[PDB]
Design a binder for this molecule. Sequence first.
Ligand SMILES: CC(=O)SCCNC(=O)CCNC(=O)[C@H](O)C(C)(C)COP(=O)(O)OP(=O)(O)OC[C@H]1O[C@@H](n2cnc3c(N)ncnc32)[C@H](O)[C@@H]1OP(=O)(O)O
Ligand SMILES: [Cl-]
Length: 159
Amino acid sequence: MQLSHRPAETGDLETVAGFPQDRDELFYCYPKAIWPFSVAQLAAAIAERRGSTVAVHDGQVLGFANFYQWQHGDFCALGNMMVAPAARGLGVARYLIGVMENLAREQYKARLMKISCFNANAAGLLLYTQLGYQPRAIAERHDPDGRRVALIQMDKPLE
Ligand SMILES: CC(=O)SCCNC(=O)CCNC(=O)[C@H](O)C(C)(C)COP(=O)(O)OP(=O)(O)OC[C@H]1O[C@@H](n2cnc3c(N)ncnc32)[C@H](O)[C@@H]1OP(=O)(O)O
Ligand SMILES: [Cl-]
């Protein structure tokens, strides 16, 4: 998987808004969104966030991520991490997380990256563990059916 990256563009949003395959996946990567996902919901997140970036391979947009918190000299918090279903398990998220780590360091002078994953998202928890993130805290949250879930907050030093 040779991959490139660039800022997200308007024409990318239809494709990216197709990445979550079901209500669970949408909850995991964007818990304030409501199913079905739409370009309007994606565009609204982009407008409130920073660093919205796509990963591209062989002319296809395969991954998306951004920051929902940014604090210069301090940390960024990575969210909306989503990969095309036909392209999972090929390193897209690993590549994109590295690009976002570099952007945090270079543009934000961040010392730390924060992420939070819902307990049911095994793939996400294992992704960030593989990339050297460690768990710090667990917070109670609710899913769209009002059921109690656990949000696992993790972080990683950027040096
Ligand atoms: C902070 C957040 O935004 S959390 C939200 C994460 N997003 C979602 O859950 C939305 C739906 N899911 C997806 O988009 C994807 O499955 C992602 C983002 C979780 C993973 O993206 P991928 O590009 O498939 O992951 P990538 O291939 O880069 O794998 C990197 C690591 O993730 C983990 N991983 C990825 N998929 C799986 C899986 N199906 N089962 C177990 N571990 C997995 C492994 O640790 C893997 O490392 P390895 O292959 O060296 O063992
Ligand atoms: Cl998010």
